[PDB]
Design a protein around this nucleic acid. Sequence first.
RNA 1: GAUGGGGUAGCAGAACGUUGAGUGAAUCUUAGAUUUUUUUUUUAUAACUAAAUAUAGAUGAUAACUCAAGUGAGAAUGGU
RNA 2: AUAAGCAGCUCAAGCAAUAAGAAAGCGAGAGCGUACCUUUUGCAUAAUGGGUCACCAAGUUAAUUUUAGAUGCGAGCGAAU
RNA 3: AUGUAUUAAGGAGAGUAUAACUUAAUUUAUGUUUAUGAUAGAGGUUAUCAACA
Lengths: 198, 272, 48, 40, 57, 350
Amino acid sequence: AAVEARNEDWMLGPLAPRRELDEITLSNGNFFGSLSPTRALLESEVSEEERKARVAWCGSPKFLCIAPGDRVVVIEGHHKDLIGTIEKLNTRNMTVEIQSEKLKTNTTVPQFMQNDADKPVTQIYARLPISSVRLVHPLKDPQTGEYRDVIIRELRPRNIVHDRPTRTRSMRRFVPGENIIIPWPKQEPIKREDQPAD
Amino acid sequence: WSLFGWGKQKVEERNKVKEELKQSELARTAAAHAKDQTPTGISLKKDHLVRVVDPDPRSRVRWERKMVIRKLQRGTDPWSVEPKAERIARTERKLVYKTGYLPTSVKKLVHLSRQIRGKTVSEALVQMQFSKKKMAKEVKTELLRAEAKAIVTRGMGLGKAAAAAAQKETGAEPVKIQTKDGKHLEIRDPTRIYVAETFVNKGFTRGVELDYRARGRVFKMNKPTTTMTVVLKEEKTRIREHQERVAKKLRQGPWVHLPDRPVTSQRQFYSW
Amino acid sequence: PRRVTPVDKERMVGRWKVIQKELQKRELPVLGTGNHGKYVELKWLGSK
Amino acid sequence: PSQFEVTKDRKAIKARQSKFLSGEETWAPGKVNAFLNSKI
Amino acid sequence: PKKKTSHMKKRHRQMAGKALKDVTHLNRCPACGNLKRMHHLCSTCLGKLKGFMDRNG
Amino acid sequence: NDRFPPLEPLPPAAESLPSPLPERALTSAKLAALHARLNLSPKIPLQTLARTLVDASADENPQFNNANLAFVGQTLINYHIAEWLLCKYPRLPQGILFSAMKAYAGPKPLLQIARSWGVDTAAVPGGEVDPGLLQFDALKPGVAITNFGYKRTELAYLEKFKWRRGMASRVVLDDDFGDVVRSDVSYDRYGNPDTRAAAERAHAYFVRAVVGAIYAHCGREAAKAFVKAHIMSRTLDIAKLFEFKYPTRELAALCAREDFEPPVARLLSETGRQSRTPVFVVGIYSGSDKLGEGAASSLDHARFKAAMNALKAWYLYSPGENPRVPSDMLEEGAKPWTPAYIDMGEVISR
RNA sequence: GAUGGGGUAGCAGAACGUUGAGUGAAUCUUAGAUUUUUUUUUUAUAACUAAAUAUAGAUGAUAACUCAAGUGAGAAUGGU
RNA sequence: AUAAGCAGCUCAAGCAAUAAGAAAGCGAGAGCGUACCUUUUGCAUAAUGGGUCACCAAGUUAAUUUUAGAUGCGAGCGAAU
RNA sequence: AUGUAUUAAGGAGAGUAUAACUUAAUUUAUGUUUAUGAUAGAGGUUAUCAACA
Ligand SMILES: [Mg+2]
Ligand SMILES: [Mg+2]
Ligand SMILES: [Mg+2]
Ligand SMILES: [Mg+2]
Ligand SMILES: [Mg+2]
Ligand SMILES: [Mg+2]
Ligand SMILES: [Mg+2]
Ligand SMILES: [Mg+2]
Ligand SMILES: [Mg+2]
Ligand SMILES: [Mg+2]
Ligand SMILES: [Mg+2]
Ligand SMILES: [Mg+2]
Ligand SMILES: [Zn+2]
């Protein structure tokens, strides 16, 4: 459609149509310039071979060296070089949410979850795969002595130790080649409560 | 958010999807930014559209580079002229509308398309309202939908008020033309929308019905669906096309009594 | 000694120097594809 | 097509149709159909 | 049939004089002004008057 | 870049110059081919043939351009074509004489001659283009070649209020064809009726400059031979340049001037009278001599056609197909000159 | 100033094309490889020129020579 | 829309490019021409087969026994050590 | 298709965390190595973020 729209605008000029005011496309049900919730959230289940590729730069799907709270930088798409903080991380599809205003995109809301008075289209933060982002961490420059932000291209796990009684796991992450152990981000543990039925 | 993956979740997961839409509605909220959204909630900011309106900038940039070079090769040519098609696209409005799938056949709907062919939208709508055909009700509905997209998206039929003042106040004579079929018309509003082209197309098979016949024979009957495509234009097109047919007839020269018809056979001698 | 490309032909006729200013004025690439990157809409969805 | 329940997109195009015809709004060409660097 | 009918001869049989005739016997209702058929009642005013004579009589 | 080194080496200041340098003409294969395609004498170097392709619109310097070369060649072309028409058709009316000249040495034919030579144009002039291309800028009409006409004091009224302009004065005031005198950049556009006139003008100045180059290097006889080979060799039917108004009165005035008997139209043959396509063959006699004849589908038209053919026969009188020209006496070793026939002038009638 | 020139059954010679393979870890490709179209030229079952449309850097295409065949369809009341 | 075409071939008026340059195509009119295959002494045959289009669909492989050409060795050849 | 290695009784019905399989349908333990692996965090359903034996 973008191939047909670019040509139409080039030929018509002052008669360029107002496509934003047209009806939805029945082939998919989306408005103009609007994505689908499945495509804006990337809720599609991918192959297990694809999951291993999305985190090839940050270890393995079961040994993941990126956590929510890390500042990453986009390296693909229109919003390249955009730096943001991770809010949530989905390990099923290996996607990540960066609540940045520039990453918002129009989305067609389905009607089974919308009142007759609400607007059909809305703007929501778009998810990205982990392969399209890289970690941004400040490292101390040894010769100058000042701290500047750098982009980490690769991460690997280190000092892995399991606890069979508790079925827990604690390890560290470092940058290969330079061997710089990067601390984990401050994560808040889930709040466990005692219910009356317990 | 799928229709089926919406009830198999907990209210905890479902309430967070409602909270996400709530914070999104608050962020969207006098006139400077009010123009950045449509009545349907589509944000007209480049950042929110670039992923759908400009999905492949690597190719659009190279395609534009092609059209720019093609335009300078014509600007440096002293003998270049704007092609006829490129001149009509930027001067004459047009809407190509394809209807939905109607429960009928091509042999049946072809006759309703040929009826509204060449007529104005107002004339065609009146003929569909008083037609004994069952699809005439569908054609009328689809023709009203097409006229709505022609007015909102293309800007057609938006000079009626300015037309009447131009002629009725001035007291001038409107334009008189003659269509390709020879029908004479007197156009007072050059923006009036009319059915320029119309054709029917075959669609997917509605269903299959088994015809059980004598001697234990069974035949499959196909229930058809068909679509109609209408091209709506303004009367400016019929005026231009008429002025061209007139100029072509005036360019063919007059009839002469003694024409200099050529002798086609060549022989290496004189026969007279 | 090498292949004669469309660019060389424009340079011979003199049109190339006019094409550079226009493409540069419109911020379009001259002899390249730019800094935009390849299509990713299908890659991000998991296309193979 | 006569029996399709008119959705919110259809109700929005009918409202604008009355605005352009009445004269409340003056039609203008699109500006977000495609993001061209030429802007022509 | 001995042979398959060609495209020319089947189009003749389908189109020559089989065009749908436009209805030109139309006029306006004297009570509302809507388009109706000549010598016929207005379907809009009929139902409305048919219902008006049902409530108050 | 490293993979695409430049094909023709050029200094960085090349694009800044309006036209390529003279020495560059010695490395262009288009020039060398054009020089041989025209069988030019080796006395004309390539640096000179290159200067004939630079229009004043591409290089404003008095040198490096066509201005002066084209003026000399125009004077030779117009002169050799003028004396040639007055010796082949000494009775041509002045208006028909102007069109005959414009039909041979005008911008239209010279454009066809330049294209007959295989001369391609450059998109935009500059010091980077091939010296073998015709360089000019059709966007600048502020360039005009010097001529021998003057600007009429009533030119403003000639064009606005349709004032009258006579023929006798066009020989002194107007140009050689009877036309009055004095009648960053963006290439995102299309052609124009002005760019076509600027392009057609550039091709004409080139053909003229080639003749001026031959005259400067070879001499006078070489220039006449070139004009006589590429221009006078063309074919033109002058009878098709005639448009008569009341030809029956002009023929009556002709017979009265020459003292011939009054012209009488006579029906030589006819068939189909009272039909849709008759044929009346009318012949106009002055006494017993048949002057002209015309066949048309009407009695009046056949009489007018017969008078027109009688006037053409008078105006298209030719002493010979290849007559002697007064220019032949300049060539030493020529026979004595015999006086040519000088006509009185075209007939002026009501 | 060489000689010869219809052709069924049938015999013989010389080639083209299709698919895969070797040279090939080769050659070329946003300065546009590839694009079932159109077009142009060349004694031409074939290739080539150019145009239009889209946009790939190799799971792409490819000359030449050679190797091997599930290799060439208007005809089987053939099959789908 | 005055006409009795296996719809092709020979001859060919005319129409056809808003413009310098550039005519593909359609074609009035005249003439020649009774599809294809199979099978037959012989088929436009009113003998056989096919509604159209696309795809699938038929001298191959093995062993054995020969011939021609090419080529290795040579009263020896080949195989194997 | 052939070859190599290993092995020497096969199916169905119904049910079940719809990768997880038998009304226990996701049992409970041991040892070793864990990024120089193998080939100093968060996470018990917001689960099974560990492979081998
Ligand atoms: Mg822990
Ligand atoms: Mg039965
Ligand atoms: Mg013979
Ligand atoms: Mg033979
Ligand atoms: Mg192609
Ligand atoms: Mg068959
Ligand atoms: Mg007739
Ligand atoms: Mg028969
Ligand atoms: Mg038969
Ligand atoms: Mg049959
Ligand atoms: Mg096959
Ligand atoms: Mg076969
Ligand atoms: Zn009524």
